[PDB]
Write a protein that binds this ligand. Structure first.
Ligand SMILES: NC[C@@H](O)c1ccc(O)c(O)c1
Length: 144
């Protein structure tokens, strides 16, 4: 199940807000709890119960930009998600990550790994100016 599959099975009320969703705007609700669990699983960033996976993010985050705060932020946000209902866990992890200083590098890792799995870039693709245009053209084709 891909990020594209997840968005296809969005309810009308959220499909109309795809573009907000895809710029990582936070939207509350049990439907968004569901969807974010879906995408976070699709890109492999969380376990089945929705707990963030430190080891899926640490190096990729530091490789994009080296920052000791990545460690701290990962531990914090795993800290948080472990304390909430499972139905909610992935979304809390993701919300916490976005609000931390790691959020901006997280979006890049996320972007790069969506596009790597979709086959649009090579596995070793870095976050370059070309990549930003590729992701722009990728979103435009989805009406975003
Ligand atoms: N361009 C953003 C895109 O990769 C994206 C981010 C977050 C999401 O929850 C999503 O469905 C898509």
């Amino acid at each position: 199940e891909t990020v594209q599959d997840c968005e296809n099975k969005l309810p009308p009320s959220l499909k109309s807000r795809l573009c907000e969703i895809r710029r990582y705007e936070i939207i509350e609700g049990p439907e968004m709890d569901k969807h974010i669990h879906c995408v976070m699983r699709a890109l492999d960033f969380v376990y089945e119960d929705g707990r963030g996976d430190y080891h899926k993010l640490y190096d990729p985050l530091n490789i994009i930009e080296l920052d000791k705060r990545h460690d701290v932020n990962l531990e914090k946000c795993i800290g948080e998600c472990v304390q909430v209902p499972t139905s909610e866990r992935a979304h809390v992890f993701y919300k916490c990550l976005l609000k931390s200083t790691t959020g901006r590098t997280f979006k890049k890792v996320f972007d790069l790994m969506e596009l790597k799995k979709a086959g649009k870039v090579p596995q070793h693709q870095r976050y370059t100016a070309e990549f930003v245009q590729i992701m722009k053209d990728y979103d435009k084709a989805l009406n975003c």
